[PDB]
Symmetry: D2
Subunit: 479 residues, 4 copies
Amino acid sequence: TMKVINDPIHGHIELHPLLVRIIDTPQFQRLRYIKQLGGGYYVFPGASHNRFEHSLGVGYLAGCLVHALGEKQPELQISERDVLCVQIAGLCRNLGHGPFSHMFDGRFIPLARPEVKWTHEQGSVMMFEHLINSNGIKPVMEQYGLIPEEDICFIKEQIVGPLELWPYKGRPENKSFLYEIVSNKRNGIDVDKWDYFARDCHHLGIQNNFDYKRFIKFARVCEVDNELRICARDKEVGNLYDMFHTRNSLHRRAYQHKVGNIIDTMITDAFLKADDYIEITGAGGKKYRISTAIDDMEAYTKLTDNIFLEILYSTDPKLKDAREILKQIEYRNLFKYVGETQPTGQIKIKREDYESLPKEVASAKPKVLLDVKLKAEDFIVDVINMDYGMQEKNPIDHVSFYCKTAPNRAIRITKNQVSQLLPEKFAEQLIRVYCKKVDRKSLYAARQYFVQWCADRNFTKPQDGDVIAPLITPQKKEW
Amino acid sequence: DTMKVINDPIHGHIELHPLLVRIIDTPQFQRLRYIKQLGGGYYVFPGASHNRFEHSLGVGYLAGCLVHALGEKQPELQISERDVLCVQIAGLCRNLGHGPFSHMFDGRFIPLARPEVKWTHEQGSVMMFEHLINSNGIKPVMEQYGLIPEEDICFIKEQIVGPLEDSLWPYKGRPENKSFLYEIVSNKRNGIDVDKWDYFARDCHHLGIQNNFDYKRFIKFARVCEVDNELRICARDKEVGNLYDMFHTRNSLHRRAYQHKVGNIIDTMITDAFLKADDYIEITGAGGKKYRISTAIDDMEAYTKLTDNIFLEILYSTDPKLKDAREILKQIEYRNLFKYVGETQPTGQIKIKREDYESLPKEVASAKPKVLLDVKLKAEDFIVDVINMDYGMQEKNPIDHVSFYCKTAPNRAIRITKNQVSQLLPEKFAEQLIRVYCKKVDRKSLYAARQYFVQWCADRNFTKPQDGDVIAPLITPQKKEWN
Amino acid sequence: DTMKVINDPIHGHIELHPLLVRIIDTPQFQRLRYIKQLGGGYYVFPGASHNRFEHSLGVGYLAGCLVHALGEKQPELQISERDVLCVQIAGLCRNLGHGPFSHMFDGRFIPLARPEVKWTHEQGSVMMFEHLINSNGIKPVMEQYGLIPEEDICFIKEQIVGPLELWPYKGRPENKSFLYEIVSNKRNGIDVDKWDYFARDCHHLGIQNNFDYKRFIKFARVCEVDNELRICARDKEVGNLYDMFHTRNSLHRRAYQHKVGNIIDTMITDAFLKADDYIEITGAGGKKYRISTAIDDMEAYTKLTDNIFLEILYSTDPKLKDAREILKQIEYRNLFKYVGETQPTGQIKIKREDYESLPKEVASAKPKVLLDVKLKAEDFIVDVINMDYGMQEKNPIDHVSFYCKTAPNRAIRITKNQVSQLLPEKFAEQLIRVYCKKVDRKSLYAARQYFVQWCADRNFTKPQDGDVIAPLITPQKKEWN
Amino acid sequence: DTMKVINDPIHGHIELHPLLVRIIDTPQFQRLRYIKQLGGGYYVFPGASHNRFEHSLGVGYLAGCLVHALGEKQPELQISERDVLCVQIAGLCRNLGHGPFSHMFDGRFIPLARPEVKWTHEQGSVMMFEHLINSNGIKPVMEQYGLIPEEDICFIKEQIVGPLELWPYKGRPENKSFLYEIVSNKRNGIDVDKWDYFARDCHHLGIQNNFDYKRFIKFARVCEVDNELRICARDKEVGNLYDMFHTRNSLHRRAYQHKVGNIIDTMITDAFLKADDYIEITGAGGKKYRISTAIDDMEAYTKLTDNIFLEILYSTDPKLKDAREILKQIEYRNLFKYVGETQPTGQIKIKREDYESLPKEVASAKPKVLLDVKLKAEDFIVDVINMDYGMQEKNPIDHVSFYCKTAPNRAIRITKNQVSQLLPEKFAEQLIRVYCKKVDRKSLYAARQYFVQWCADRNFTKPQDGDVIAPLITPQKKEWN
Ligand SMILES: Nc1nc2c(ncn2[C@H]2C[C@H](O)[C@@H](COP(=O)(O)OP(=O)(O)OP(=O)(O)O)O2)c(=O)[nH]1
Ligand SMILES: Nc1nc2c(ncn2[C@H]2C[C@H](O)[C@@H](COP(=O)(O)OP(=O)(O)OP(=O)(O)O)O2)c(=O)[nH]1
Ligand SMILES: Nc1nc2c(ncn2[C@H]2C[C@H](O)[C@@H](COP(=O)(O)OP(=O)(O)OP(=O)(O)O)O2)c(=O)[nH]1
Ligand SMILES: Nc1nc2c(ncn2[C@H]2C[C@H](O)[C@@H](COP(=O)(O)OP(=O)(O)OP(=O)(O)O)O2)c(=O)[nH]1
């Protein structure tokens, strides 16, 4: 029968027996050993939470929204089968995450395997297949009325989008709105964000401004260009703009914390140095590396935050370089933040150029006397793209609304119709510079290079530019 | 007498010095128990039962926390217990001047009842404070605890209302080396003060909407630095994001709650009821002389007895003089409110001034929608509510008026511009919302009101109301940009 | 007419069926906005500005949540939408009878103003409910949404005040017995009214609530018990139920019976008594009532709220000078002085009829201590407080039924010894507080001596500060030493 | 170096003195990031991902808050910056000795792996602290900030573990007696460790905390008690103190002793015992230790965290097959099945030595019913839990000193009867849980029969579900019914 789980964010969640079966597998329980915020725990000591409990919350909210829609609009013909498939997708869309979450797909794999293209979403689909097949889930699905052929396709499609006219095979256009719940490809407004906002805020000790319950109460399905889509009540548009404001705040303060990022960067370097030597046993006893475990789900099942400690506690001399980096983290001998700047006006920095940037900083020629000369290897340059989840675009332009006077007619709402105090831009870049040399004189020099580089490139004046580089800031007229 | 502890749901256990307790325990202060913080807001958010009294304790407490923290970190500032008590007193007393239903009273009622007068709750707070002190023999008690009333009462008043008037330094209660003290209770430079911090947390706790601003963090990062020969409060540079967020939070709370369309209309209805009852309700002031609702502000003894009670006095009256006033309140009880028609905004530069407000109903009634109508409405049937939404300094960016310090040189004050922070911030800092309502509540009247309204918007190149195509499908087509 | 959504800080977004909106938007309901939940408690806990109105929305909401959950889990219970609405209405309306300052009114004022009458807020709720219905044409609206007014009105009233006198109810039959356990549980006190106030009062007071009502709802089922269908709790939740009552008693100790909130309630009552001949309140047919007689006419009672406090405070009439002076003393915080607290060691406690004699008893004590000042009966207030688990000497958990996971529809009983030996051995007690109206130093000192001597004379418990406030008295009593 | 700010979800922004930061930034301290506060609890309450690291910061912070409050109010105590830092350090470091899965390690594993040893996390904390100080050159930093390591290190250790052995302490004299009451209160258990874990565990478990430590701090004073200067609480707070222990017992019942959390702890412990011959941990000089002997070497113990769980689970060595299989069963949620709970009746207490003979006893019971299967001693687990108010039979409040507002320098005692007759009459009890290693339907049915029979045979209490799980057995015992 059903199980009750007490969650600090959602209170008492009811789990259908089929969901319990999916949960109680090595492939799912794995997520207990992957921190939701990775290196962030090393800055925010409340952020101990893992992918596992977040996944439960996502499945729960996915269920709440689909339930709400069915109760309010029985004409949608939403079935218990539909509800379960949506809950399963919600539960399983985090299955693909690697050690320290975004660090793994965002930092490590791009450097370890630049040729490969890999995302946690792809991983989630693969792990899900592995989970299903390894645990005899399909029989249990039919026992509760699911049709594995169609429904597994549907679940995968919810996580990763078309496995490619209506492009989906798992459900038809009349059920289009179902695909907006777990992972919303159209505008990013989905139950995954709603759980991490509330869960991260609870753990970080910073407050959440977004009311998902409210949103759910005001959600309706309407016909939009011959699709049935979820529409928000007109008056909730303010709150949706705010939801993305909240997202960006959480990125600024927490997910892209300058020191959290530097720790992620150091752990990634440790992983790269360990990658030749750590071995992970996959299917048939075959051995994989940290970087290649993603090619075999049996191996990947055993790849979690544990690697951090395996490296730290290692005695093998081959792992000395990797282990040393982690030990510096324990002593808190971290690379030093020098400053932040941004490109001015039009300019954007391409991913291909990231590598050249430490060279550029080291090449700057501040007109000041320096005891030390710094090298490209002494600098880290971290480039972060901050947006509203659709690059340059406004996601609210891709939301449909209804008004109380005509609940069946979907409408659009433009930014001008809402507020002139809203962002005029929806994407930006932040550039952080750090120095691996931590002494007083080194650090002083790093500041001079940095601010000179900013001037040379016509980037924005660092906020403390006049303090850290008083001789340099005057040369640039704009500043 | 000794220190008291009070449990507050927002701040926990608040200790109060005996002099503060003496000030609190007066008719002039306790009056604030009978004035709702959000006025007509309570009639939309049922949790907003809170009053100005408990907010005032919170402001006093926070004012003390900040001045105390500064003193602990920088003993060189020479902050005295006397300075601390004066700051707390000002914090405690800056809300004394509020009238019935708070902003309703100074924002809606007095401007209509007595357009010749200029009145603000801030001026009221000063007058009430003076009335409190004089009426209760507080000056002697102040000197008992080492305060110097001549300097200190001046200092307290200046903290609430600003310089009592030119000059580099316009304050008389304290010198430039204590300038940072004037930034705690009521910050005239940029509006970052402990009053905001209390109502964000308190209103959110009561409203059931979450607060994004962390005042405790702010206090930990705050320092005093020399700026143009003043000692001012500086925030850590890194916190500039959070300060922009503070004003964003303020704006959210205004949008969602303080300017809720229905809460506003209820305030308007209560105001009308007061205007109708103004001739008949009698309030006894100094010497037994009698005042009206609109004139109690001229005598603080009378003003002391002017609270939300007038609402119930009107509601429960039987005198036929008050029948009209009472009927409006009764319509509030049955929820037969004036009906919301819609909201629009002026586009681009355009702004509507205070002086124009009265001509607006006539304008809407003058618009000529090319639609057959069952009924024809008149100026009197419309209410037009203009709302100013800003960052507290009209078109100005308050963050341009903030001083920061950096960790490498904690005594050196600097400035941070918007470009130095983010491109995702607002490019403007002020806008206007125009709400239209109709006093005729029948279906046919409402339908007509919608047509006049949307036509008016179009005629004047205001923004398309969000529901424009639903409420006025025949009108919206004529304006091309809309559709 | 459509459903409304309301945002509550305790429950979030609450859906209100249009029939409930029609009930709410009446003078009789909206009245509750002007009655503080905790009365004079707000004068001690400044966060406790909340009113009976918002508490009533919460009770109506919780009542709905419970009956919906029961119906979803056991469709064989045959719960109807009609049932759901009637239970929500009863929940919304069980606080309608409350008077100015809530429990002050029925607990202190009415007993003293009109000792001959017997009156409770519950009786008031039923009367107001009838007045609300009749004055606003609600009966037709009830039938529009499928209710049967005659039966359902009876059902709602029974839910609030019990049987209007085998099966004693007329509104519903034995098969729906469990519906009577939701709003106002006469069997054991476990109902949704407590659950809202625990959470609401804690939120506002700023003290923490240890009870999880949502958990309770998730684990609740209906089972047959002595040929009645009753709400049963999961066996393992029994500890949590004991904890609920423990929490209730804590809230009484810390907040609802706060020694100063109680003396403020007493002072306001004294002002009301002194104003009651002069305040006039117009009821039906233009007839005039007093504060103490407005309870006989609902039209008058409709206009009787916390407002009277201010009507007195702001009065200029000389007749109200006495009443107005007491309220002024409250403002200056010149309150009656708490002397101390004690409890009876003996069983059988103290009669309500005996209360009047107690100040005289204190004044008649003869402490062997040097006193400058002699006090009189009239100088003392003696406030007797009954603290229990809701059922006098009885354990409410003995009147709860449970089910186990291996047999969810079978009811069982659980005894205290099956749960823990850390639980209470008694479930009722009395606190006695003494105060003095003379607030000078010498008077207070004297009052302490009489008090402690009276405790001794009566074999009450030694006040906690007894050795400090009455060092000459406490040594006489050997038990205390 | 300058002060650091840390954001904690429980306490908000915590200021850390440079010296404390130096202590925190060591492998010995950072180790606490990898030990779950609640061990096996995380596997039942998914919010309880929190680790000992963040709890230890909180304890350090609250230790500072108390000592700072006392110093501000009573400057005559002569409390020094040195005293404050020492109290904070002891608070920070009193959890250093915890092992994998916290209480599992010292409460279950070590007692079984090393029955000869007497080992407490407190002893471990003192050893780790020594290691931390010596390995990281902290003593020079201590003197840089004015500390005197010989006295102050002794004082810190004494705060954690008590006298390292008439005034028995050497780190501070009698005049500073009260300082030894903040971090680890040996007199009555009222200390800042509990205050952080109540609030932190509640925040993460998703259950409510009823104790207000900030209130307690505000009302705390130091008074002379029998020639010692001790921390005293305001008299009126006594209710809140009883409630603090009530809350602790509720947390244990609901969470720390959850039946499934406990069985998971038990399973993990077995896995560790089976891996103990084969897991190696490198300590000082490259030498290798076992899980059971890492406690002997601090360098090894440093690297002994919850990680061993995953090292075993991910292992391929066939010698670890048995240990790895137990952990794999946990992942599949194939746990030992809860059969039931009972308690000893009246007088009886269960001895530590007898724990191992209990499964044999259950298997020896002869239930008079037809059974498909016969079970053996090895198929049963019996878990005995001692629940109390921290001082076995004793009432901690009998060991607390109070003051009253009329004489704040005069310490007094308050007895239970002076407070409430609704309090516990007993302060310790035992709970006995039985589980079955055979999880099939027939086996579980049989296990229920043996269990209830065993309860009857030993005159333990009737399991709450006894009539449902063993309807044929419960009849025989008259007392039960
Ligand atoms: N909030 C709260 N949560 C609890 C309490 N006791 C347990 N929980 C949590 C732990 C779990 O996450 C969830 C379900 O725990 P239960 O003890 O109800 O489940 P369990 O499977 O052990 O009971 P069963 O005997 O199988 O029905 O609730 C409680 O007293 N209060
Ligand atoms: N959080 C919490 N607050 C309480 C409790 N008891 C009272 N309060 C609140 C009510 C007040 O706002 C504040 C002070 O109440 P007290 O009873 O300590 O002050 P009171 O003047 O009655 O005591 P006194 O005998 O004059 O020291 O704390 C409690 O147990 N917990
Ligand atoms: N949490 C939250 N509550 C809100 C917000 N806006 C309004 N509320 C509260 C006030 C009310 O208690 C409740 C319903 O307010 P609404 O403005 O949504 O309904 P109203 O009847 O004004 O609009 P409608 O009739 O749907 O046009 O929600 C918001 O953004 N967040
Ligand atoms: N509540 C809140 N906490 C924050 C925010 N930013 C950072 N924190 C947390 C993370 C840490 O636990 C703690 C200190 O963060 P900071 O960014 O002030 O420290 P950091 O050492 O990076 O600053 P530094 O540049 O060294 O002064 O506060 C924020 O905006 N809000």
